[PDB]
Amino acid sequence: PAVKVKENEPVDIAIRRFKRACEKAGVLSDVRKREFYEKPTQVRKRKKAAAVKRYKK
Amino acid sequence: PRRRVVATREILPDPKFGSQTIAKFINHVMSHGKKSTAERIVYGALETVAQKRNIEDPVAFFEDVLENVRPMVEVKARRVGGATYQVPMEVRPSRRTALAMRWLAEAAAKRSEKSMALRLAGELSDASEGKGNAMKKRDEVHRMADANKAFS
């Protein structure tokens, strides 16, 4: 998640590009999973429910 | 009222000065329907201040003082996630005028002078020169927003 900003460029647009890069790399979800431990059975059940939702979509 | 917005009633401008704001101010001073008393009190106070300041246009002086008095930003409470915190928001144009008029009336209520007209004239003078309880109240309203200024 490294972003390079060109010379004489607004700060806000670079900030927005950095946010897009972080979203593309999916950094936040890793930290969200890390913050709290989750039971493996709960993980498996959630994965199955997500799979069913994806199938309906 | 979770219902359509409706046009506000058209106010009747005052005769002597022919100004909307003056009658709107007289409305708040009016109590128990004594518009005749409010007219006299307001005219007396305005005449006293105008004589003291040797200004030809009391209506213009009143417009300047009211514009100074009105607060730009007022804090409004908001509920998010079962929590209550202050939120600074820009005040509505008409609400600024209404707030200033109400605050001036309230302070004129507690001014020392024996007669209401003299209390009101003193409060207008203090408001014009940025002193007194009305200016303190406006400063407090601004201060509450300035203290946190962490929302919106």
Binding site: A2, V11, K19, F36 | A150
Partner: protein, 114 residues
């Protein structure tokens, strides 16, 4: 010292911004508690912005004209700190995220029930 690297330890509870040289030495640091914001007021982007401004000034006395940001942690004020640097006028060569991503190295705390 004519080049600077900024480290931001942002976190939901609190955000810390510090200014360091290229070699890896921290000239000065700023914190929200020093500003005095507490609790919910402390954990807000503006509380991050003000401390970022203070740290930027502190670095200005040292004399670094160019600084590059290194954000760490999923704070809500990480954007506001970079906005604060931009408003101060520090020029940023690049924006990078150095958040640690541990690959199930250590067990996380038990889930909280409310």
């Amino acid at each position: 010292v004519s080049e600077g690297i900024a480290h931001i330890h942002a976190s939901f509870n609190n955000t810390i911004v510090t200014i360091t040289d290229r070699q890896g030495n921290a000239l000065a640091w700023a914190t929200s508690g020093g500003q005095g914001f507490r609790g919910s007021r402390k954990s807000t982007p503006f509380a991050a912005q003000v401390a970022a401004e203070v740290a930027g000034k502190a670095a200005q006395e040292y004399g670094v004209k160019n600084i590059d940001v290194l954000v760490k942690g999923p704070g809500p004020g990480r954007e506001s700190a970079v906005r604060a640097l931009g408003a101060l006028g520090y020029k940023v060569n690049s924006i990078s995220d150095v958040t640690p991503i541990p690959h199930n190295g250590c067990r996380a705390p038990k889930k909280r029930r409310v």
